[PDB]
Amino acid sequence: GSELETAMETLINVFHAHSGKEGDKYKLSKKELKELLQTELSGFLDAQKDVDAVDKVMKELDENGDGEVDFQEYVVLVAALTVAMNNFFWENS
Amino acid sequence: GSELETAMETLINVFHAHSGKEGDKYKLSKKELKELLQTELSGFLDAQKDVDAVDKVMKELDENGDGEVDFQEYVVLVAALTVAMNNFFWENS
Ligand SMILES: [Ca+2]
Ligand SMILES: [Ca+2]
Ligand SMILES: [Ca+2]
Ligand SMILES: [Ca+2]
Questions:
Q1: B93 lies in which domain range?
Q2: According to the annotation, is A52 in a ligand binding site?
Q3: CA A55 from centroid of its chain's CA atoms
Q4: Which end of chain A has fewer CB atoms within 10 angstroms, the N or the C?
Q5: What's the CA angle centered on A21, arms A15 and A25, to 5 degrees?
């Protein structure tokens, strides 16, 4: 498998483990998601009031409007954040 | 950095290297994208006529309708495919 595929598997393992740790194993609640990204993602720095925006972005990602996310919503949710790291990269180099 | 972040960096390195290899370094053409995913992604098996759908999905991902993709479009483009691997996982176990 390509390195991209190797990296991809990582998303499932972390999603499954963290999701499994709290709440229903099958579903990840927003509360679990917020804690997951805040701790695991550099966004921790954005934990301040900026973190509130996290609530705002969930609405757009969730077509259901349910407030809950599925693996499909999660993969795109992290993908959007990934772009931010790219922005950060600009700061270095 | 979290494992997810470690895996995330992989997307940039592969995107940059492959994109850099052919065409403009700054932009990735669809032709380059098709070859990249076909070879690097298991989708290689789907290289058959199914591969044609690859053209169809690009239209939805590209808001511009330009036929070209940016890192932002690419990250979501791979994210959609990622879900397919999950489907594959069901076959195993
Ligand atoms: Ca859960
Ligand atoms: Ca939802
Ligand atoms: Ca290129
Ligand atoms: Ca485009």
A1: 1-93
A2: no
A3: 12
A4: C
A5: 65
